[PDB]
C-alpha cells in the first residue's frame, strides 16, 4: 500500500493500556498465583503469552473471570512478567532470573525465555 | 530501574491485537457509523482516541455493547482510522484526506489531525 506510519503509535497504545491496568479500568480477569491476585486485560495477556492465547481462545475458558495458575509458579516471577507484557521492560536480576525464566517457559513467552538463557549462560 | 527493554514488544502486541480483531476474538463493542458496523476492543479504542477514552470511562456508557457515532461521520474515514489504531499505518489519500481529518478531529486523535493539516497545507 501507500500508507504512512506513526513510529511511536504502538508504544503509546501500550502505555495507555498500562494506565488502564493501573486504574483497574475494563480489566476482565484475575490471575491467581498461590496467595496472590493480579487483575489484567484478557486481550493483552493473549497478545503476550502462548499459554493465555490458548486459554482465552477455548470456548469455555474464554468466559471465566478467574484463572488459577499451577502452584509451582512464583508470584514475583509472574508480577515481573505481567509488568513486561504492559511495558516492554523486564526487571531481570540475579535473585529473580530462575523464577522469571521458569514462569516465562510456563507462559510461553519465547523472547523472555531466550534472554534468560543468554543471561544465565554468561554467568556460567 | 535496571530493566532491559525488548524493542519490538509494543509492535508485536499491536499486531496480535489486530489478529484478534480480524478473527472477532474478545471484541466487546460495535461502533455504528450510519449504515456501517465495526467490531472492536473497547481498550484499544480508548488507548487511541480521546473520544472513546471519555465514553468508556463513563459509568453508564462503559457497559454499552453498541455506540452510535454522529451522522456526519463518514464510514470510510472511520474504517481508515480504526485500521490505523490497530496497525500504526494510515491510508491517507487525496480522495479521503478531508473525511479522515474530520473523523480524527471528532475522535480526538491529535497526531492524525496534525499530519492531515500538514498534508493539506503542502497542497495549497
Amino acid at each position: 500500500d501507500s500508507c504512512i506510519q506513526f513510529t511511536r503509535h504502538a508504544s503509546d497504545v501500550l502505555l495507555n493500556l498500562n494506565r488502564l491496568r493501573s486504574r483497574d479500568i475494563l480489566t476482565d480477569v484475575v490471575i491467581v498465583v498461590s496467595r496472590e491476585q493480579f487483575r489484567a486485560h484478557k486481550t493483552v495477556l493473549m497478545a503476550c503469552s502462548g499459554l493465555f492465547y490458548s486459554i482465552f481462545t477455548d470456548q469455555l475458558k474464554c468466559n471465566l473471570s478467574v484463572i488459577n495458575l499451577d502452584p509451582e509458579i512464583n508470584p514475583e516471577g509472574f508480577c515481573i512478567l505481567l509488568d513486561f507484557m504492559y511495558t516492554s521492560r523486564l526487571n531481570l536480576r540475579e535473585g529473580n532470573i530462575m523464577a522469571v525464566m521458569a514462569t516465562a517457559m510456563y507462559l510461553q513467552m519465547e523472547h523472555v525465555v531466550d534472554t534468560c538463557r543468554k543471561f544465565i549462560k554468561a554467568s556460567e | 530501574d535496571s530493566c532491559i527493554q525488548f524493542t519490538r514488544h509494543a509492535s508485536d502486541v499491536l499486531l496480535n491485537l489486530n489478529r484478534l480483531r480480524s478473527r472477532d476474538i474478545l471484541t466487546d463493542v460495535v461502533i455504528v457509523v450510519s449504515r456501517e458496523q465495526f467490531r472492536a476492543h473497547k481498550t484499544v479504542l480508548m488507548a487511541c482516541s480521546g473520544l472513546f477514552y471519555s465514553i468508556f470511562t463513563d459509568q453508564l456508557k462503559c457497559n454499552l455493547s453498541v455506540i452510535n457515532l454522529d451522522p456526519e461521520i463518514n464510514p470510510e474515514g472511520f474504517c481508515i482510522l480504526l485500521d490505523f489504531m490497530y496497525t500504526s499505518r494510515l491510508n491517507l489519500r487525496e480522495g479521503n484526506i478531508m473525511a479522515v481529518m474530520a473523523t480524527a478531529m471528532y475522535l480526538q486523535m491529535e497526531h492524525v489531525v496534525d499530519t492531515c493539516r500538514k498534508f493539506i497545507k503542502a497542497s495549497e
Binding site: 500508507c3 504512512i4 506510519q5 506513526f6 513510529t7 | 499505518r89 494510515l90 497526531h111 499530519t115
Partner: peptide
Amino acid sequence: WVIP
C-alpha cells in the same frame, strides 16, 4: 510519521 515515516514511509514504512
